[PDB]
């Protein structure tokens, strides 16, 4: 695995992000975990592709162009902003708005969000 | 595993942070990965316990009260700030200063850092 990749065990639901990679395959419930490739699980561009807005002092990330549901069984678990050596993650819960603001100084950012049912998606500045 | 716990495979070096837990044991190189419990690997309080300074607009995290080495074979791989549903991580490389600033609005924070040789450490505001 590679730094910052997200892996999920399809059997039990564990999901991890790689902080230091280069080793063997991560395993869980006897099977290699699945690499959650961004946009890999064709869901709803309108509702899953993060929308990146530059605002005072940082960025407002909204998922998506159309608000994505935030229900008990279908919600955006987190929104992660990637920029110059940083990973800033806001974990969200059902009932929250599918948006996150991060105070960060950087003109180039990558935004990723993960939907419990729909998988991993990203967008770039 | 539990949300935000860090696991390392002692065999191959993979290190991951749990984003969604509650499943089976994470496995790598045929053995369950090791849970890197903060302050669990008694190293150097002076050099591993993060020092948390509140400054304009956020926090400056320094590892530690005495600067920790940042050499090719012994360095702080990242500094992570935990506060109200957020995980903000700055990944560091040899040659960098063992410090990180995060622009965040919150009076209660937890700072963790990971030293390649010394393991996982934290401190609270
Ligand atoms: Ca993070
Ligand atoms: Fe599993
Ligand atoms: Fe969805
Ligand atoms: Fe391994
Ligand atoms: Fe050390």
UniProtKB/Swiss-Prot annotation, chains A, B:
Keywords (A to Z) from UniProt: Detoxification, Electron transport, Iron, Metal-binding, Oxidoreductase, Transport
CDD domains cross-referenced by the UniProt entry: DSRD, SORL_Dfx_classI
Catalytic activity entry: reduced [rubredoxin] + superoxide + 2 H(+) = oxidized [rubredoxin] + H2O2
Binding positions for Fe cation 1 per the UniProt entry: 9, 12, 28-29
SUPFAM superfamilies per the UniProt record, alphabetical: Rubredoxin-like, Superoxide reductase-like
Gene Ontology process terms (BP): removal of superoxide radicals
Documented EC number(s): 1.15.1.2
Cofactor: record remark: Binds 1 Fe(3+) ion per subunit. The iron ion 1 is coordinated via 4 cysteine residues. Binds 1 Fe(2+) ion per subunit. The iron ion 2 is coordinated via four histidines and one cysteine residue.
One Pfam family from the record: Desulfoferrod_N
Domain comment, as recorded: Is organized in two protein domains. The N-terminal domain has a fold similar to that of desulforedoxin and contains a mononuclear Fe(3+) ion, center I. The second domain contains a different mononuclear iron center, center II, with a Fe(2+) ion.
Extra remark: Catalysis occurs at center II. Fe(2+) ion of center II is the electron donor and is converted to the Fe(3+) form during the reaction.
PANTHER family hit by this protein: SUPEROXIDE REDUCTASE-RELATED
Family, per entry: Belongs to the desulfoferrodoxin family.
Subunit structure: Homodimer.
Protein name: Desulfoferrodoxin
Organism of this sequence: Desulfovibrio desulfuricans (strain ATCC 27774 / DSM 6949 / MB)
């Amino acid at each position: 695995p590679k730094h910052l990749e997200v892996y999920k065990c399809t059997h039990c639901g564990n999901i991890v992000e790689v902080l230091h990679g280069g080793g063997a395959e991560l395993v869980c419930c006897g099977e290699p975990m699945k690499h959650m490739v961004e946009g890999s699980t064709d869901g709803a561009m309108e509702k899953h592709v993060p929308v990146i807005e530059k605002v005072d002092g940082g960025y407002l990330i909204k998922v998506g162009s159309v608000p994505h549901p935030m229900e008990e069984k279908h919600w955006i678990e987190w929104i992660e902003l990637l920029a110059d050596g940083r990973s800033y993650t806001k974990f969200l819960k059902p009932g929250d708005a599918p948006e996150a603001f991060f105070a960060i100084d950087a003109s180039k950012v990558t935004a990723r969000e993960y939907c419990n049912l729909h998988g991993h998606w990203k967008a770039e500045n």
